[PDB]
Amino acid sequence: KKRYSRXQLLXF
Amino acid sequence: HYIKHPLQNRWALWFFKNDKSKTWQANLRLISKFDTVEDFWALYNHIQLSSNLMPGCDYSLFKDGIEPMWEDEKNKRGGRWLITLNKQQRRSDLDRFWLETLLCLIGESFDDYSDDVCGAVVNVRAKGDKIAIWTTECENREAVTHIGRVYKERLGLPPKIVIGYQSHADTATTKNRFVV
Ligand SMILES: C[n+]1cn([C@@H]2O[C@H](COP(=O)(O)OP(=O)(O)OP(=O)(O)O)[C@@H](O)[C@H]2O)c2nc(N)[nH]c(=O)c21
């Protein structure tokens, strides 16, 4: 539904 | 970039201050709540690291409306995947493991078993630091064991290293209901 990978979270 | 990135769930960060003169529940403190990626980092980047907490203190991250205690309706039939860490590497590795755990939660890494996740807790302790994922129902074998396996993988624990799940009811009255 709303998922984020570890790399998507960390690039913020 | 200009729009915030929503999380699936709103989460609450709690802090437990070791103060023996008060009851356990009174030592809990709601720090803040967030429901976007940007707001997660704004919180995380400006609070003290787990490795710099006094022994006996905790951080907990739980879905909005679930208090980080056994007694909550969403925890009382549930349990935890428990990781107990060696003291030597706290400076080097506690913070990394806790952040990896936070990212598993907020990113919804547990796939179709996301609803079973309640939260996670890090305990800073003289006898060994602990990190745990709390789930809602010890009887939900499929959910509990999937969460276990994904968590073990995300921490980088090898096939040899087995972790265990125990019910909160058993802890509060300890053997493993499940292992992965
Ligand atoms: C998670 N939790 C901990 N406590 C209290 O805090 C004590 C310590 O529980 P702890 O989880 O802080 O473990 P610690 O490593 O300090 O000690 P261990 O028991 O050897 O692992 C418990 O014996 C309870 O009195 C709790 N008390 C209540 N009422 N509810 C909770 O959810 C809860």
Residue numbers in the entry:
A (entry chain B): 2 to 13
B (entry chain A): 33 to 205, 211 to 217
Source paper text:
The eukaryotic translation initiation factor 4E (eIF4E) protein is a vital component of the cap-dependent mechanism for mRNA translation. We have used a structure-guided approach to rationally develop a set of hydrocarbon stapled-peptides with high binding affinities and residence times against the oncogenic eukaryotic translation initiation factor 4E (eIF4E) protein. Crystal structures of these peptides in complex with eIF4E show that they form specific interactions with a region on the protein-binding interface of eIF4E which is distinct from the other well-established canonical interactions.
The hydrocarbon linker was found to be exposed to the solvent and did not engage with eIF4E. In addition to these canonical interactions, we noticed an exposed untapped patch on the surface of eIF4E with potential to be targeted by interactions with the C-terminal end of a modified peptide. Next, molecular dynamics (MD) simulations were carried out on the crystallographic complex of sTIP-05: eIF4E and on a modeled complex of sTIP-06: eIF4E (generated by constructing in silico amino acid changes in the crystal structure of sTIP-05: eIF4E complex).
